[model samples]
Target: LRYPPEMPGAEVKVYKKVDNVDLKLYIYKPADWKPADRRSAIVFFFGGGWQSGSPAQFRPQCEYFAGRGMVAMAADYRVGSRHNVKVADCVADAKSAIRWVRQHAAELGVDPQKIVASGGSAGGHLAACTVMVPDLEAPEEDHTISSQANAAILFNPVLILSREGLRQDWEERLRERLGTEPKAVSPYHHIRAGLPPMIIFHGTADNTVPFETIRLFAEAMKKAGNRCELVPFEGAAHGFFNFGRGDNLAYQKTLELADEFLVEIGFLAPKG
Candidate 1:
């Protein structure tokens, strides 16, 4: 779904290396970006149920945010098909990517306190995990730097992998790979007070991820004394927010809501 050859404006940086594989971060910055400018940033991960996906999936999103005066990046992590790894590895890579960005915030022209984590579906899970899961850091990472995102923007994420009848196959796969239940890594199960503020966009008609799951997740977040906003799309389905999916309205609407959310959270300036 990505045209890597056409993305000439992006800078490819290796943020992590594991087992001879170099995980990359495709960064997009504003045309007038300078090293001394402390801009807010966001990192997005792609969705493929943790099996197969490309950073290209969020290329347009990165470009859009960059144009909006924010530094944006799409990260590459280990997945089942390409890396023969498990979901735990994906979480590790996600955390490491956030840490790398935070560690290099000054050089990257990013505001260390204003970084956001965002992604769709399985990638959304990773984004939430970076903030919620407390123990998935890669072994080689420098623990001194924090991997937590200041805020989160999730799109139809698989927030509760331990739920019955929801990707039971992947649940079994995770169990086989990690040799443990998924409760420890499930974002919904890890909610607590003082977590970062979050906004979620989900379609009510989404079949892949139940809408009620997000509703409950939001409710629980509020109950835990955290801030969370849920934006509902009336009849859209899974992946409805993706560009060129015959649902341009949903895509535009979600983008508008996301922009409004960023502005509300003080990550973006109000329009003049």
Candidate 2:
């Protein structure tokens, strides 16, 4: 799908080239962006249970962040529906996307140390995995460049992919893609000290991904000496933060919270 015409300031850049597909990034930058200007950056992935979705889902967020004086990008990754691939491919693509940005930070006018990863649902899982789950890097990617984000903004992410938290059907699907030991890709299983700071927004009423799972993940992150902040949306459900869905209030609220979190982390300057 094409980005809405009303929303401007985006240019597509090829970040990675696989056998038959060229993964692209829709990048947004300040109108007065310059090569010498060191700015914070954010990369967003879209959610579709790791099966479907489009980078267009984050178009509004990219524009908003660009307007706030930060470089923003919405990344396209392989998914089951489009690429007939598995979650492993998704994870690898996520890592490659981050590494590409870091490797090209000088040209993009971004600070390599201030890249933030943001996403919803399965996309959020990939975002977290890019930093937490090691050894899943794409073989063709430059290993010298790090895929780690300085911080993360997750919306109703599926932090746990193990049989303990996921439904039986999901467990089967995961097994089909990741083999017997899926824990290798489960962000919850990899929580440890020295992870980047994170702010998670999850609806208490989400049925697809249990809110309790996120609670446990946050608890583990904190116990391991990492910073994790959980913001519970009282009655929201999965995708409540999605624009043009349910009440517009949730979308606005999420954006406001994200802005506040970015400012608090020094990713964006506080508004006057």
Candidate 3:
């Protein structure tokens, strides 16, 4: 119920650049946060059609996690609207953001092995790609440091594009941007054993992503022996869990669920 300005200020930085566009990362940490201690960190990407979006979409969540003793950040990536980049480029930017966070973990007081990637919709796809998609990394950056997320928190993400029973119009608008067949980037098709644990928040009636699609992705994850959970909101639609939606109803509920999941996985401590 708190506004962002009432929370801690973010330490913003330009994490990467593509086509001369400087991508920013708005990072939030608790007061007296120290680099000497290695704490779990989470970075959020914004939900857009790969064409438009703002990192501010997750600023509220970042501030909340910062107060909870996590080094939280909302990262800006090159989008189609601003950078004329392809979906592949967006994937590269997402990978870059995660690697950048892990690379500077020591100085940011973050535990390199405990970095979590999170986002909503297209942003959620970016987060999932960090752990699921195997390639499409920005070749310019050093690959010595891994770009995979230790865990994932996704909200209404697009995970299975190479399938039936889901919307395909996206393939027409964004397919060209992918610069490749959907199977190549579809995380569902690339599911392998031992991938990072993940949890999904989706609405049963989400037409944009389709509840059936996420359900199948979770099932695929579990079949591959990965830790995955899906929390479905009956009768709700896409982006229902976003903050400031439904008078914060779905947002509060999803946040509490995320808290429990993080605590269960040892990524976060239960509030005293």
Candidate 4:
């Protein structure tokens, strides 16, 4: 409840509570929205390598989506430094966020079938994981309710942790973050016949994760007949697509393509 005093212009609601710590979602909805309206919703998670971050990281995006006539949210999850939880807990919380939004769809005026999950870096990893990774849900969560996203929009995400997909030099740190064999929770290793459509914005020169990884994923997605879009920015690096970075060129471009994909998928109507 005492998270950010700034609160900005969004309403806050708790999505999950663990060991007395409350995880929240900073939500933005159209000003003229009513509970009877079946609006689409998008949820965002902040990037910090599963270590530390705040809902503030995605506030601007939430505001933009709200202005576009959709409900948007920035979610809070347990991080290593903040709550001493591992990346697995982050995935579980991501699922809970999606489920919470769907469960309350009627009251929130949301179209339960149009929820999209998105994030940056480690947070993006969580976004893809909720759609690809399995068996990682919180023990106490309602298993009956589905946690799958209709689609995903990732920003410089860490999608591959399996040794086969990662450079040996990056293995050690990723192993520590995952606290297990990387493949068990790695999204790239789990690609299958069907998954929600995805659009990833990454820099070709990303320092944290290699561009090859997402390229491989996109190829695999297409091979499996799934919809996956990989937008690579020339000469950009990690965090390039984030808001307020270097004149925000990548940010603006990514948002434009993101909007197009959402509308193409019939998730949103073209802006008037």
Residue 15 Cα positional deviation in candidate 2, in Å, after optimal superposition: 0.7
Residues 200-230, candidate 2, lDDT per residue (tens digit)?
A: 9999999999999999999989999987989
Model 4 TM-score (2 dp): 0.93
Candidate 2: how many backbone clashes? 0
- In terms of TM-score, how similar is model 1 to the real structure? 0.93
Instruction: Give the whole-model CA lDDT for all candidates, comma-separated.
Output: 0.87, 0.86, 0.85, 0.87
After superposition, the stretches of candidate 3 with alpha carbons farther than 4 Å from their true spots are: 1-8, 164-175
Cα miss at 246, model 2 (Å)? 3.3
* 28-86 per-residue lDDT for model 4 (tens digits): 99988997899889999888888888878888788888988889999999899878888
| Regions of candidate 4 where Cα sits further than 4 Å from its true position | 1-5, 165-177
- Model 1 Cα shift for residue 69 (angstroms): 0.9
Provide backbone clash counts, one per model. Answer: 0, 0, 0, 0
What would the per-residue lDDT of candidate 1 be over residues 148-239, giving only the tens digit for each residue?
99999998898986765337787687688743568767898888899998899999999999999999899999999998999988897989
Q: What is the TM-score of each candidate against the true structure?
A: 0.93, 0.92, 0.92, 0.93
Question: Least accurate stretch of 10 residues (summed lDDT) in model 2?
Answer: 1-10
* Full-model lDDT, candidate 3: 0.85
